[PDB]
């Protein structure tokens, strides 16, 4: 009912979801809940996920990713400003053909933190989980982009970043979107 | 009526409940209330319990569990990110045949805090309660999974953890859900109503 | 749901939105969300962006700008009090012909100062700073080196000087309601 | 809404606006927004701006003033208790003929803060702006009251203040209002 | 919250409550409520209940001017304490409609003297002028000579309800609200 | 040093130490340190432990007790105001013959109800062991049977100075310190 | 100095140092500094380390241990109240023959689980595995127990009374009262 | 306090302690101590004990320049962890006088990049220059090729004491300080 | 005194002063006081001012500079890590011949805050002062380095920075010092 | 007993005291106490008051001034950085012939704004404000109406302008140690 929350709620009614912050457990729960709600309201219409996020934990990002896949809806993704670390991952995880960058977007590859510190197991068990989910993240990024997994890993290690044009050529997105199409003849970006 | 609470309330109308935090007395009260509410609203329709929880006390988790059993309707459970300690327990406690993990969910076994320290009784009485409920936690986890109770105990002792496939194999869930089915040909995950 | 937020929400129903403070990530998220919402509600009706802002982060301002371009509808801009630095940029980014200054508005040009190391952040800052210069040159019709030099010395403008330099298309004094002047979002 | 805000919102339905604190950037935004909203709802009916304000920055007051002029409807102003500094200015800026003082209101002239230090610009650039808007504030106060600009500047320098009757003679307001009229005899004060 | 909800519902009965010290925030809140009630119906009385330990002259004078601005009569009720500017606003109610409850206490007082950016000298000039108006208006409300108002105020003279009736602050003591028709309804008989 | 600490430090020079608050781990560390320090400085001179303590944990109290035993010198104890729970235990643990109560001191028996990285089961095992040993030692200090100690502790039995003397917590009541070598010097005759 | 600090500094002059809290990086720095200082002041006189500690990190404990070995002086250790986790380890690491428990001391074994590193959790885990194994090895060496017994007992948080701790090998003797005349251990109080 | 008092007394033994993360405040503190010890006696060694998890390049380079400015030799001792700039300062000790304790760990690392009022571009230019100098000096300290320093640093390569000796960070492992005369005295033999 | 302050006081006994933080009014007072104290103790011996400072206000730096000149003894300066803005200025203001940079010191030119907003005077009056002291700061930097005033102002405008060797060539310091000399061969750095 | 306070105390032994901040009741108490102490220690030796102050309360400054006059010894004053408002007043109140400005010092004239009611406080403020004007006229030799008018517009001075107007007697550049120039408190 405050202004910002009221606007997000009305955007939800247009099937538009915002990832505008660091990906942590709280944000994952919040985004996961919205994807589930939109799916329940209409499982046949696209969800539009706009991303301006400086990064996030692997664990929290993977929960959002699994919910994107769980949703029977297509999920279009839009690099609105920054898409770094798991923000890059979730952008690239959009339904193929419906992944977009705005022209001044910036995509950052990065080894994020695991987010596996929340439970009271020793560091060895946390490191085990981290190794497995990091390798899975590399593998999925390779599938999203079409790049060899060795390319993904080396670029992640050196924190390679991408302009919108470079991200398009690497394969994180399918198009750079400049202005939304409303009369047909191109992407509507959820603006009908 | 803030945005987060508003979305949770609208999910409640779909009979979807979220366990998104460490399980303590306040979260147990919260979850118990939602299960009772949904049962009272319609005792014939499934409840869908989504779990992304890093752990919790035995005492608090046992109150949720008893309320899950009290509810006349089935409770489907979904490992959405992490189901650790009593979060694993409550996931495995779902209606058999309706326990699910998403493909990258993780399940972690753990010997948790008892949650018995809030009493006005001495530590000897608190320890007596702890020993009883810890043993019963192991026994129930063995019944949920089909594992021998001695394996439950040893694996909990060493903080054994599972990928979603491994958790299905061990017995915590019945199925891995990749995409929800809107077609009847499979689990709807509460999204087809 | 306090009074201030209630008034902003009711203004949203008139397709009026406010950039009333320093541009940062929170403000950018809020403003982008409002632009997307107004676009989705009716992609054929103008959005009216009122600006009274002392500046802010290039990165946040650029994200607002890209959302302005994404929107299918025209975005009219109004310099209400101050339009400084990224506030100037977004004023000048309005749909050409629909950029306005109120009579005592002031426009100020400025070069803002800027998980991966400082080198990566500096590289990203360099591209968006260069883009801000290039686009400011395009909005105003001024040579890019004039934008750079004027920005470097914090050159500022009255409404009439801002009109002559090319940040805005017209000065509005009062709104036209019967429909042959700018209605400033107030004639519906 | 709490009680205070609910009463203000109900007064908004009567086209009554309250300026009850110092004029800073936040208050200017809130005031500008209410003026725009009331204009959009009905551009043919007066707005009634009640003023009990101890002062404010020139820059914030000028933003409010330009929005008062932008409004196609008239803005009646009422000095309810204190109208000091930019509070006096906004009182005097009401639609001529519709500027009122309650019998015990006090009007105070003052040369205030510019409110121009929020920018990242050099203090030389801030002072340039301050000199321009200060001079324009004097010129407009002279236009509002009918006093020569030299008298405005001298009286502001010495923080000259006025009772309601003295404010009427000097030219800040057009009438002292004692009780609102219920049948077109005198001013209704927005309570019609 | 509950408190605000009860006050809002009392507003629908044209009852407003001054239950605290009179400062600028309270002045704004009460002024706003009087204007709102006047706009909603300028022909119906407003009922102003007072339990206030005092407040600033400037803030109390803004309320007083709003009471006089309102076209409605304003009945006033001393509900527990009416001290300093609370006494002033009580005695400022529509004559014939000023009431004290049987155990109410009315206290006279001279408040001591600052939100302007002008020097202390200009602030003291204002205080002197409003202080003298306050005395003059208290004299007119009560029928007492201004010299008696000033002398009694400086010594913090206080009054029981019957003493306040005799002095001239209120017109009646109200023990129980009359739904009879025989007597004041205190706003409780709609 | 501030004033309070300077006075305690100067009292340390007279071999006088204070248990003036609840016995927790921090207090046990400070008292243990003071007992070690005095012992090292002169293992042949008495330490004078003044007690005005409302209680404390068994574990912290037992660490102090063990350090009192470790000390080669006698530890005289003085119930200065209250000696409750582990404060009673430590009073009663003073060198036999050198345990004193001031005339209006009060001694209270009590069962604490009970930190580690181990689970509550291991904590309760340790607690059961130290609780039983505390009852056993209280019996030896006082000469009372263990079952009386346990039952009196369970009901929070308390004692005046004279009652405490008779039960066995202290050996003498001290009213005024002796300067002339007559009786106990209370550490004040150096 | 305040009272507490003043008493600790004066104990330092008697070559007595006090481990009365959880072992973390700050405590390790404080204790390492005191050991170096006493060693510099007189490398021929014992240091007496009194321990009432509920646990601590392996990394912090091992830094203290290496400084204990670096010191040319013998380091006598005393279990004063609790000696748990790395507090047990430091007790058992005292100079052999000069490790002591007071009669009501409790000794608890524990695997301390789990980072101020700039390196990722994988590198931190590699380090932890190395120091954990070395901690088990040394504790086996201090006590005479086989490493597998040390590991299994640590895993189940086995605890010991003073008498059980003596029999297991953590300490060499139980002290009741300090001897000032040479008939037994002086506990650093006989100077 | 006690901690500061022990450090001050160690200063009288020409022993300084880097026990935390290297930031500007730590740089100022350590630089000041090296200058003070140099002024007090420019012919006697300084003993720098290191237990540090890392720190900023700029702050570590200021310390390094002060170590080189000092006319005294500076012996360095890896006491628990020497990571990132802590490794750098360890390896920067006077050659032949760099020591690791047997369970010390040495970690290589590239710190990421801001106190100036200049833009991020000028701050990144500075970081690039100091980062390259850090690699070059690590190569000279260790005898390793600069390419190996950069490659090992980016993967956070870490070392046991024996591995660090072989790689070239330190000259000796010290197990026990020698007051013999046969071996290093670690500053403990004055 | 805590440890840090005790070491600084002992360095004061060696006539060594530390400027290790931003130059504000408090730091200027502390620095001025130490310079006056060392002058009074022995006006014939050098003071050694070690500098590791990220910047500061013009007004505060000018107070320190005037006190450096007031001191009858010489003030040697040493760039220990960073000497930025008024930190560069005070470094360059050392007694000519006795200005030193350590090999990895960095010198940064910058046009800083005036520090003239503490007064109760009008912003116009503050800007007048700022213009005068800024111009004098450029003129003195030109005098210290031997560079023309136009180059000082242009380089300050672009935040030009310098390695120790570049700072030596430009004129901020007279020598790079690597190790202090113990026998009158080279500079003793106050460690003599 | 931190470093900063240790240095000030040691300066006190050179009879040097600092007015380095805004003048308020706390600063006035501290400065009066130092003047009384230095006077009691040796009433024949100069006190050296260094001033770097942006102004403050008339009442607190006047109490410092009265203590300056009470002191039997001369008080030399030094404008070290800023001497504004009551800082200017106390600079100009120094023993005539022993008032000094450092070369880049700035002097600013200013009219500060101001248990008993506001009327009593305003009356007290009026007398000390009038006294500040009268004494400033006496210190400088300027007409009282010039002090008032110049104070009213925040007139400010460089060191040389301050010397010409009469706030100080000399500009000191560097201290004279062998004894035929001002020693600034540094020659003992």
Author numbering:
A (entry chain F), D (entry chain D), I (entry chain D): 11 to 202
B (entry chain G): 11 to 203
C (entry chain E), J (entry chain E): 11 to 124, 130 to 203
E (entry chain C), H (entry chain C): 12 to 124, 127 to 203
F (entry chain A): 11 to 124, 128 to 203
G (entry chain B): 11 to 124, 127 to 203
Excerpt from the publication:
The ClpP protease is found in all kingdoms of life, from bacteria to humans. Here we show that, in contrast to this general architecture, the Clp protease from Mycobacterium smegmatis (Msm) forms an asymmetric hetero-oligomeric complex ClpP1P2, which only associates with its cognate ATPase through the ClpP2 ring. Our structural and functional characterisation of this complex demonstrates that asymmetric docking of the ATPase component is controlled by both the composition of the ClpP1 hydrophobic pocket (Hp) and the presence of a unique C-terminal extension in ClpP1 that guards this Hp. The catalytic residues (Ser-His-Asp), of this complex, are encapsulated within the barrel-shaped proteolytic chamber and access to the chamber is restricted to a narrow entry portal at either end of the complex.
The structure of MsmClpP1 was determined to 2.0 Å resolution and refined to an Rfree value of 21.5%. Similar to other ClpP structures, MsmClpP1 was composed of two heptameric rings stacked back-to-back (the asymmetric unit consisted of one heptamer, the biological tetradecamer is formed from crystallographically related heptamers). The tetradecamer forms a compact barrel-shaped oligomer with approximate dimensions 86 × 102 Å. Compared to these active structures, both MsmClpP1 and MtbClpP1, have shorter handle domains, which lack a structured β-strand region. As a result, association of the heptameric rings in MsmClpP1 (and MtbClpP1) is mediated largely by a trans association of a short section of the α-helix in the handle domain creating several openings in the side-walls of the ClpP1 tetradecamer. Significantly, the breaches in the side wall of MsmClpP1 are located adjacent to the catalytic residues of the protease and as such provide a direct path between the active site of the protease and the external solution. Hence as has been proposed by Kay and Houry33, these openings could represent an exit portal for the egress of peptides. Therefore, we postulate that this structure of MsmClpP1 represents a post “substrate-cleavage” snapshot of the protease. Another distinctive feature of MsmClpP1, which is absent in many ClpP homologues including MtbClpP124,32, is a short C-terminal extension (CTE) ~12 residues long, which docks into its own Hp. Specifically, the CTE interacts with three tyrosine residues (Y60, Y88 and Y110) within the Hp.
